[PDB]
Design an enzyme around this catalytic site. Structure first.
Site, PDB file in Angstrom:
ATOM      1  N   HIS A  60       0.860  -1.201   0.000  1.00  0.00           N
ATOM      2  CA  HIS A  60       0.000   0.000   0.000  1.00  0.00           C
ATOM      3  C   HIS A  60       0.918   1.283   0.000  1.00  0.00           C
ATOM      4  CE1 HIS A  60      -0.295  -2.195   3.749  1.00  0.00           C
ATOM      5  NE2 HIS A  60       0.159  -1.043   4.363  1.00  0.00           N
ATOM      6  N   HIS A  92       2.533   9.010   0.625  1.00  0.00           N
ATOM      7  CA  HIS A  92       1.248   8.902  -0.038  1.00  0.00           C
ATOM      8  C   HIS A  92       1.358   9.677  -1.330  1.00  0.00           C
ATOM      9  CE1 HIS A  92      -0.858   6.840   3.255  1.00  0.00           C
ATOM     10  NE2 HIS A  92      -0.004   7.496   3.984  1.00  0.00           N
ATOM     11  N   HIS A 115       4.841  11.160   5.965  1.00  0.00           N
ATOM     12  CA  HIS A 115       4.400  11.008   7.346  1.00  0.00           C
ATOM     13  C   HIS A 115       5.542  10.413   8.174  1.00  0.00           C
ATOM     14  CE1 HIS A 115      -0.131  10.522   5.906  1.00  0.00           C
ATOM     15  NE2 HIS A 115       0.143  11.802   6.144  1.00  0.00           N
ATOM     16  N   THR A 194      -4.296   7.016   8.916  1.00  0.00           N
ATOM     17  CA  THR A 194      -5.050   7.191   7.665  1.00  0.00           C
ATOM     18  C   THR A 194      -5.277   5.957   6.854  1.00  0.00           C
ATOM     19  OG1 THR A 194      -3.132   7.687   6.303  1.00  0.00           O
ATOM     20  CG2 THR A 194      -4.129   9.686   7.529  1.00  0.00           C
ATOM     21  N   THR A 195      -4.787   4.828   7.321  1.00  0.00           N
ATOM     22  CA  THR A 195      -4.907   3.542   6.703  1.00  0.00           C
ATOM     23  C   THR A 195      -5.386   2.595   7.781  1.00  0.00           C
ATOM     24  OG1 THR A 195      -2.734   2.602   7.202  1.00  0.00           O
ATOM     25  CG2 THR A 195      -2.824   3.987   5.177  1.00  0.00           C
TER      26      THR A 195
END
EC number: 4.2.1.1
Length: 255
Positions: A60, A92, A115, A194-195
């Site tokens: 991811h 991201h 991040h 966020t995931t």
């Protein structure tokens, strides 16, 4: 879960119900409604002693891991209480230069978002910290396309070795100070990962000032694969979650 039409952000609530909780992230930073708080202290980033171990394709995104067995790379100051140690950093990004960051500023979307993840040492390990409301501290940094970022090249040249899901590569002596903007002015609010599992355990600290990266740097990011080796090739692009409802929370500014 993923970022596709069948397993994308809009679907995560089925398996992770907190997906539509009260302190979800990311969010839109409305600079006119953010409140200047004079009681916020300057951020204190101590990373001269940081020890990078490896970089991995988790399917991811790509993560750079760091030895968090001692206070080597830490964050304190600002809105934080106690010492938070750097465990990992990730990105991201999008398919185009016009999208990619998770957080947005007055609705503006940046090319990517960095991040830096840190956990509260009071809790002893990462696993215990993500079960706490003041468990993590993520340092968010926006990426814009312009000139190359000397400090990011080391990362870019190794992407070729971890093209597919599960691949990892020894990645020592990488200095995170090379990815910091000039200014440390920030916005701060209480949110979540966020995931998935989207745990509502994060103190977000989003930096005002973005770093610039060249078109070719970001380009190598878009050559990463979601898929495992030997499977149909799915480009790892747009691995960002849409902005969530602020819902009462308030965003503070140190400026």
């Amino acid at each position: 879960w993923g970022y596709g039409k069948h397993n994308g952000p809009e679907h995560w609530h089925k398996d992770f119900p907190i997906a539509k909780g009260e302190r979800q992230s990311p969010v839109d930073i409305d600079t006119h409604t953010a409140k200047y708080d004079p009681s916020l202290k300057p951020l204190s980033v101590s990373y001269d002693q940081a020890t990078s171990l490896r970089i991995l394709n988790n399917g991811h995104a790509f993560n750079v891991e760091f030895d968090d067995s001692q206070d080597k790379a830490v964050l304190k100051g600002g809105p934080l209480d106690g010492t938070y140690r750097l465990i990992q950093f990730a990105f991201h990004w999008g398919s185009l230069d016009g999208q990619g960051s998770e957080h947005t500023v007055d609705k503006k979307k940046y090319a990517a978002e960095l991040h830096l993840v840190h956990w509260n040492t009071k809790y002893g390990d990462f696993g215990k910290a993500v079960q706490q409301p003041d468990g993590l501290a993520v340092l968010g940094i926006f990426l814009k396309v312009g000139s190359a970022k000397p400090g990011l090249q080391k990362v870019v040249d190794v992407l070729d070795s971890i093209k597919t899901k599960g691949k990892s590569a020894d990645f020592t002596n990488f200095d995170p100070r090379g990815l910091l903007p000039e200014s440390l002015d920030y916005w701060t609010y209480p949110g979540s990962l966020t995931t998935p599992p989207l745990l509502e355990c994060v103190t977000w600290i989003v930096l005002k000032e973005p770093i610039s990266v060249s078109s070719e740097q970001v380009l190598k990011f878009r050559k990463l694969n979601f898929n495992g080796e030997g499977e149909p090739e799915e480009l790892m692009v747009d691995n960002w979650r849409p902005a969530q409802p602020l819902k009462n929370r308030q965003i503070k500014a140190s400026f």
